[PDB]
């Protein structure tokens, strides 16, 4: 509360560390469905169904330009990519499997880097 603060957790390396995680996600072999924004002209249903599209290139640009206020907003956008994928794709599809694999990969790197 006012004039009562928990001890200051060191967040000065968070930007660098989120960038490293994001590089690892970008270079994973199963990243290909997620590298670029879904083409809303070419994919029927996407625009109406997926209210907040998100992709790794968009996260990279937001990261690079100070548009994440803290590491939790960064994780929310990463998780959005996989939540969108599960909304639109069957589990038993190449893309659906890719999304599960990537979410797992991310969540481990997240735990190991920060928790």
Distance in angstroms (rounded) separating the CA atoms of residues 101 and 4: 42
Model resolution, angstroms: 1.8
Burial class (CB in 10 A: 0-12, 13-18, 19+), 30: middle
Helix 71-88 × helix 56-64 angle, to 10°: 170
77: its two tokens: 């956008």
Is 88 in contact with 82 (CB distance < 8 Å)? no
Q: Which long-range contacts (CB under 8 A, 24 or more apart) does 74-81 make?
A: 74/18, 75/110, 78/22, 78/25, 78/106, 79/103, 79/106, 80/52, 80/54, 81/34, 81/54, 81/55, 81/56
Q: In the chain, where are the structural domains located?
A: 1-115
CATH of domain 1-115: 1.20.920.10
The CA-based angle 25-74-29, given to 5 degrees, is 10
Experimental method: X-ray
Q: For the packed helices 14-27 and 56-64, what is the interaxial angle rounded to 10 degrees? A: 160
């Amino acid at each position: 509360s006012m004039s009562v603060k928990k001890p200051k957790r060191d967040d000065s390396k968070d930007l660098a560390l989120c960038s490293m995680i994001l590089t690892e996600m970008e270079t994973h072999e199963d990243a290909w469905p997620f590298l670029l924004p879904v083409n809303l002209k070419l994919v029927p249903g996407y625009k109406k169904v997926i209210k907040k599209p998100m992709d790794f290139s968009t996260i990279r640009e937001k990261l690079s330009s100070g548009q994440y206020p803290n590491l939790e907003t960064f994780a929310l956008d990463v998780r959005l990519v996989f939540d969108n994928c599960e909304t639109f794709n069957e589990d038993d599809s190449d893309i659906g499997r890719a999304g599960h694999n990537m979410r797992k990969y991310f969540e481990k790197k997240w735990t190991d880097t920060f928790k």
